[model samples]
Target: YPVPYRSKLTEPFEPGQTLIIKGKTAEDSVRFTINLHNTNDVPLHISVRFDEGKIVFNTFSKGEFGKEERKSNPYKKGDDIDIRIRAHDSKFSISVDQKEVKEYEHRVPLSSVTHFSVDGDILITYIHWGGKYYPVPYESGLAGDGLAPGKSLLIFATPEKKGKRFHINLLKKNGDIALHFNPRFDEKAIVRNSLISGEFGNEEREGKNPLEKGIGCDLEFRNEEYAFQIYVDGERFATYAHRLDPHDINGLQIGGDVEVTGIQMV
Candidate 1:
């Protein structure tokens, strides 16, 4: 993939760091994760932190742009941030997955952030080559697209590997796995394949990394779409929707079947 924008100003941050952000609204789900190498890969890290009172946000990178904090702020629903900011005073900072990159420093502390409209469009780095706050926009879904419910926009697929298992899961509001399914069966003697389905016992869950048995698999996911059909040695297996759901699909198993390895929202 090619990026239309580039910057050298950004740097990685260590863990256990803190930042002071003047959010557009008092309440927002501030993300505190790190970004992976490409837009299509699974984010290396992601986490959630709620902003009740403005202070330092801590996060564990779950995947790209994963560490997030927000609180239903009126400021997050639209474009056009509240004020015109001079380059020196407008501040923004980010941490990658659990690593701190930068912290907030108000150079142009506007009179108030009350009027700011926060965009889902996030800028992790500042483009100051010309001496202005030239932000390199992450341009994932910067502009709004009007779509009805159940509209198809992107497709995701997992990599296939023999002898190892892949997991596809859905998380509830509490961030726990509501549904955990896999397509690999347990091997009689192997350590990794000790458990087949459901939550693995503590001894088995730590068995195999699952990813180690693949033909060079990658563990990261991103906001891009991946589309293809499943086939067993050239015969058609099945066609999946752009998005798959447990409530809608059927036939899950513990071995010799397709398993979800990652997630994407494109």
Candidate 2:
């Protein structure tokens, strides 16, 4: 079904961010417009006309519009498409269904755009506005089933420059830490140990720092029968042996100057 959709962006549209739209065109669709606008003007206007079999890209400024750049249509009526727009320093790179379509230069600073609106003949199933920084000191937990051997925790985050440390803990239900994984940037080492009966066990600090300031990285913690195997971006980073039964692990805590983009478990 063709429907109009519009939403205000929750945050500033920053460079390096990407907007993803997934939908299918209506069988009898004539035209549709995906626009990023401010109060006064549209910074970007992407219009697709099925009858003409072309896509028109243009921008509006003050009271005038730029010359429309038309391209052969990459879409067809009733066809599903995945559209991605990536913000760059000078232009917006557009791709359809994973294939590069065209680059639209910024006649209007993308930062000035505050809202995204889509109108005309399309049915959107998913719209994602990602590539924004999350607040720091972000903490979240998961609990339902016990954490057992072969279980894993995955964290995705971007570290801040000049930050001291960030900590990830595998906790027991009663607030005890079965494993403490703390990275101290100021000390240039990752400390791994266990907290048992309110006492810290001997620290293990032999892993290389895989975290780079301002870059996204993945951290994985996998529980073995005797130890936790930690990996950073798929490479082994550290290992901390379990002092208690791994199945007793049921909580996780993470916080610090890191921007946590996502978290998952398996």
Candidate 3:
């Protein structure tokens, strides 16, 4: 998607709905705006002003702009950012990168906000709305050609607060786990290993923990000839050696304490 993009939804906005935007600010970008609007009012307007190093939140109704709520900008020019705004019961919950940031109480009926748009100096990589709950112990097949040397898996999730641990599994058709990525908070180790036949192999528990409790994460699982490369956020975190052929990875499973927003195998 390009800058200055807008979409009019057929259905009105509802509580629990979230608007997720993933993009990069231009090298010389000064500012950008994201709006949740309707024909009559702009219920929520977010302005990221790089020129002032501040982010502002406000509203517009009838013919007036409301008082603004401001904060220091968390996003930097020429950097990728993942921002999300959820229509909460009382306020809009905003998240920058993966961390929860602010709450702007509703100034107007959320049902009236039926449009979403992004404008200013930024390159839009992805944007969409999701309100459905992602059940735990989630599972999905690696669609199309399954996993190949050049294929990848992308996941957007937030680790639960007080979560002991969570795991991401790449499973074979026969139920063997080819690669198990376990980020354990209780143990303070990011573990990786394989499950062949009916037994688990020795755990590879040497890696930096890239996840934080209650924070959203964009995880990438890259298939390669000899290893599965794992990236938490945008940093390369770990590599797990292949124990089974990539083509045999037919499933992906996520379980434990976590809220998964989206997952894609491509």
Candidate 4:
């Protein structure tokens, strides 16, 4: 929603990729459109008609408009909104303000889409398209010296639909794991543990599933004096009492069936 904004995509929109838009509806707005297309064909068209309070999803190709389905409008005038669209093999999952809204099946292969455009009366502040080929056992260090009390780590990821399992570790300088966050989709639980003296500690599992197959998720781990507070999609989910010196945590490691899109330390 940028009142006629358009950008050319540098890469193909494939499975595991995401397009995110942070915006707000104009106070006097009646409608807006988000379009994904190529030079010759329009693969996705999302039209939000505030006057009717309905969101219409459709496609256009070869001078023809596809069937348009109207769904509930999740936007309110002058209210901020976050729109996330994730690509899958067969469809695109759309979420608004962190809530799942609708799924649009592909009328054209997503890989063929190359442009993103927004038009109408809305204020857009952020637009991001992200995806990467994550190597197995991917490891990366935080920018600062180490994690201390009051520090926080944020991760953005999407879970795989098949055979999904992933691990996130807060690692010490000497190769020890201070905290291990593991999500096993097959098991439908998140396992938290630690490693000391080359041995793994007991697994802790006591929260609702925060990661869902084929959906984007936001995870935050904030360090406290005696525990690490965990939030999933902005809601407090679990807390892991400190077992190792939190100050020793200097790096993060991730692995398995998850696409790491963004990470931040604060």
Specify the highest-lDDT model's number: 3
Q: Which run of 10 residues does model 2 get worst, by summed lDDT?
A: 131-140
Top TM-score hit: 3
Put down candidate 3 lDDT per residue, 93-176, tens digits, no spaces.
Answer: 899886888999999888879899899988899897865456788987777588778888888888998898999998888999
Which 10 consecutive residues of model 1 have the lowest summed lDDT? 130-139
lDDT of 4 by residue, 106-199 (tens): 9987877899998887788888887544565678777676678988987877676674688899998888898999998778899999998899
- TM-score per prediction, in order, is 0.20, 0.53, 0.80, 0.65
Q: After TM-score superposition, what is the CA distance of residue 240 in candidate 3 from its true location, in Å?
A: 2.1
Better of 2 and 3 by lDDT: 3
Q: State model 4's lDDT.
A: 0.83
Predict model 2's lDDT versus the native: 0.77
Candidate 3 residue 29 Cα shift, in angstroms, is 5.2
Q: How far is candidate 1 from the true structure (C-alpha RMSD, Å)?
A: 19.5
Candidates in descending lDDT order: 3, 4, 2, 1
Model 4 Cα shift for residue 245 (angstroms): 9.9
Q: In model 4, what lDDT does residue 130 have?
A: 74
Residue 187 error, candidate 2, Å: 1.6
